[PDB]
C-alpha cells in the first residue's frame with residue numbers, strides 16, 4: 001500500500017484532520033513529504049495531517065486564491081515569501097510564535113525571509129539552493145577543472161563544446177537561471193525601493209546567455225527538466241536547484257558531480273537563488289486544527305525529520321540540530337554532495353518578496369528571457385518591455 005493510501009486510511013480513522021496543500025507533483029519531494037506525514041500521524045492518537053496535491057507551485061497559489069474567494073482555506077499550505085506577502089494583505093496568516101512553535105536554531109538565512117514587520121509568518125520547510133551539476137567523466141576526459149569563477153565557467157563551456165561538437169552548458173530560459181547570472185554580475189532587483197528589470201547587470205546577464213546560444217556553448221532546454229533531457233547530446237554543466245539532486249543521480253549515465261557555484265573571484269563561491277517553500281497556518285482554521293499544525297510544525301523542525309527529508313531530496317536542512325543528527329551524519333559521510341549543498345547554502349540570495357512577484361517572474365521577466373533566447377529579441381529591448389509591463393502592474 002502506497003504512503004498516500006496509508007495516509008488516507010490514517011485520516012479516515014482520525015477525529016481531527018488538518019489539510020496541508022502542497023505543490024509536489026511527484027518524485028523524491030512528494031515521497032519524502034508523504035513518509036514524514038505517515039510517521040507523524042502514527043505518533044498522534046486520532047490527530048492527523050492530510051497532504052493534498054494541488055499541482056505545481058503556481059497551481060497551488062491559484063488554488064489558495066480560489067479558496068479565499070470560496071471562503072474555505074486549508075489549515076496549512078506551502079508558500080514562497082511573495083505568496084506570504086500576498087496572504088498578509090488579506091490578514092489570512094497566524095503568527096507562528098503565537099502557536100508556541102520554537103524557532104531558535106532555524107538558519108537565519110531562512111528565518112529572516114519569513115519575518116514581515118518583525119513577525120514570523122512561516123516555518124522554513126523545503127528550502128533549496130542552486131548548485132553546479134556537472135559531468136565528472138566529460139571534464140576528466142578533456143582535462144578541464146571544475147570552474148571556480150564565471151570567467152572559468154565560460155572558458156570551460158567553450159573548450160568542451162568545441163571538443164564534443166555540441167553546446168555543453170544546458171539551461172532553462174527562465175527567471176531562476178537568469179537570477180544566477182544577474183546576482184553574480186552585481187545585479188540587484190531593488191534600487192531605492194523600486195523594482196528594476198532592465199538594469200545594465202540584467203542586460204549583461206541575458207546577453208551572456210543569448211551570446212552562449214549563438215556561439216554554440218549554451219543549449220536551451222524547452223521540453224522538460226534538464227535532468228529529463230540527459231542522453232541527448234553531450235552535457236557538461238547546469239545551474240539547477242539542489243531539490244533536483246535525486247532526479248539527476250537517477251537519470252545520469254555518467255559520473256555526476258556537484259560543486260559550489262562559480263563566483264566573480266576565487267575568494268568566495270557564487271550566490272545561488274534560494275527556492276522551495278515555507279509552511280503557513282491559516283487564521284480561519286479551528287483551534288483543534290491549529291493544535292495539530294503546532295505539533296506537525298515542531299515535528300518538521302526536529303533534527304530527525306529534517307535529516308531524513310533533506311537526505312532523500314537535496315533540500316538544505318533548515319536547523320543547526322539537523323546537521324548534528326546521526327542519520328544526516330551517516331549520509332554525509334558516504335556522499336560529499338550533501339556537505340557541498342550546505343556549503344553553497346551559506347552564499348544565498350532571494351528574489352523580491354513583493355506580493356505581485358509570482359506574476360512578474362513568470363509572465364513578464366520569464367517571457368522577456370524566452371523572447372531573447374528563443375525568438376532572437378534584443379536583450380535590452382526585451383527587458384525594456386518587461387520593465388514597462390512590471391511598472392504598469394505595480395501601479
Ligand SMILES: Nc1nc2c(ncn2[C@@H]2O[C@H](COP(=O)(O)O[C@H]3[C@@H](O)[C@H](n4ccc(=O)[nH]c4=O)O[C@@H]3CO)[C@H]3CC(O)(O)C[C@H]32)c(=O)[nH]1
Nearest residue numbers: 024029057058080082128176225241243244247275276358
Ligand atoms: N510558483 C512559484 N514558483 C517559484 C517561485 N520562485 C521560484 N519558483 C519555482 O521554484 C522551482 C524550484 O523549486 P524547488 O522546490 O527548489 O524544486 C522543485 C522542482 O524544481 C524540483 N524538480 C522536480 C522534478 C525534476 O525533474 N527536477 C526537479 O528539479 O523538485 C521540487 C518540487 O517540484 C523553480 C522551477 C519553476 O517552476 O520553473 C520556477 C521555479 C515563486 O515565487 N512562485
Ligand SMILES: [Cl-]
Nearest residue numbers: 263268269270
Ligand atoms: Cl561571490
